[PDB]
Amino acid sequence: PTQMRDLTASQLLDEITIGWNLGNTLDATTTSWLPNPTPAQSETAWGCPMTTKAMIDKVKEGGFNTVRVPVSWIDHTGSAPEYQIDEAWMNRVQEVVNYVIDNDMYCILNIHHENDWLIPTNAQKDSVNARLDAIWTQIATRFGSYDEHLIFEGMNQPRLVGDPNEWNGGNQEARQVINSYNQTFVNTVRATGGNNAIRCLMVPTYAASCSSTTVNDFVLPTDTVANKLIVDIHSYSPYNFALNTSGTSSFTQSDISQLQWTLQEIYNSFGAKGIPVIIGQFGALNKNNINGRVLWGENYLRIAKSYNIRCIWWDNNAFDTSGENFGLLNRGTLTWQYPELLEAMMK
């Protein structure tokens, strides 16, 4: 176990500058077509090249001092009830985490696309809580020796898949059950002891969404140490410009006003109430609209800083694919594909 400062979440978040997601990488799943992938088969399954320290070096040089490492464990988790995590996968995750930690950066490690089993209903609650404890015990034990620069995030976007309001707050039952899942995660990490007793921990709302219904029903977990919990909100806003592939590519003054209200709501919901909050995912799709995204990006970061809210770009290394093109660092050439946009978010 390494020497660790006893920092509050607010103090830790003030040392972050801006963050970068290693997207569509260790979070890639193959569930429907390749059971039991080896670590490399998963990491490359969605088209990204295998990750290198040189990549993270470049992220740091670009002005980011924090990397979120989204990790999907489902394809690497054994049968119930032991839910043994494949040793080779745990080893590879640790290698990538070390690319960040060895760069003196902050690192956020989570569980990501677990929705096949992580279902927020009363019927599933006991079974899901049992598996959360099984896997977070393994993960927290492997990484317990790390200092304050490593943050555990208990879940990504827990939600009611298939429900008419899946992406609209679900139902009250789902929002309340997610409170139990967040509490189990905190309980499981703290029980491993050591540095994990005072590590900062991140928890999402329903779908990591900030809205009246997800905020109203949210219950901050009870903890065994003071001021170590952080809420993660994902906010690809304004929606029509930043997230909707069939929405406008123009960014207007009205969009600036909407962004002001949206990020203000994140602050008023959590930071204004003594709950530290981070925007763990944000971005704007490539719509062949560099001038629009530059104006969007300058205003997003300006407003975020005015509420002291840190932001983490979702970088999925996709530029002109058939899908969501949120790439920023071209991993194939180790070059920034849209340097104007990087500068807009670093100024």
**Cβ–Cβ under 8 Å, residues 59 and 21:** no
Site for Na ion in 150-189 (CB under 5 A): none
**Is residue 138 involved in binding Na ion (CB under 5 A)?**
no
Cα–Cα distance, 183 to 169 (Å, whole number):
19
**Is residue 77 involved in binding Na ion (CB under 5 A)?**
yes
Q: x/- string (CB under 5 A) for Na ion, residues 260-279?
A: --------------------
Supply the minimum distance, in Å, between the C-beta of residue 124 and Na ion.
17
Stretch that binds Na ion, among 77-85, 146-154, 164-172, 289-297 (CB under 5 A): 77-85
Nearest to 154 by CA among 120, 134, 181, 176: 181
| Number of chain residues interacting with Na ion (CB under 5 A) | 1
Supply the minimum distance, in Å, between the C-beta of residue 101 and Na ion.
27
Site for Na ion in 56-75 (CB under 5 A): none
Supply the minimum distance, in Å, between the C-beta of residue 42 and Na ion.
11
Nearer residue to Na ion within complex by CB, 40 or 346: 40
Q: Nearest to Na ion by Cβ — which residue?
A: 77
Supply the minimum distance, in Å, between the C-beta of residue 12 and Na ion.
33
In sequence order, the β-bridge partners of residue 234 are: 281
Supply the minimum distance, in Å, between the C-beta of residue 86 and Na ion.
9
Nearer residue to Na ion within complex by CB, 25 or 77: 77
Nearer residue to Na ion within complex by CB, 161 or 334: 161
Tell me which residues touch Na ion (CB under 5 A): 77
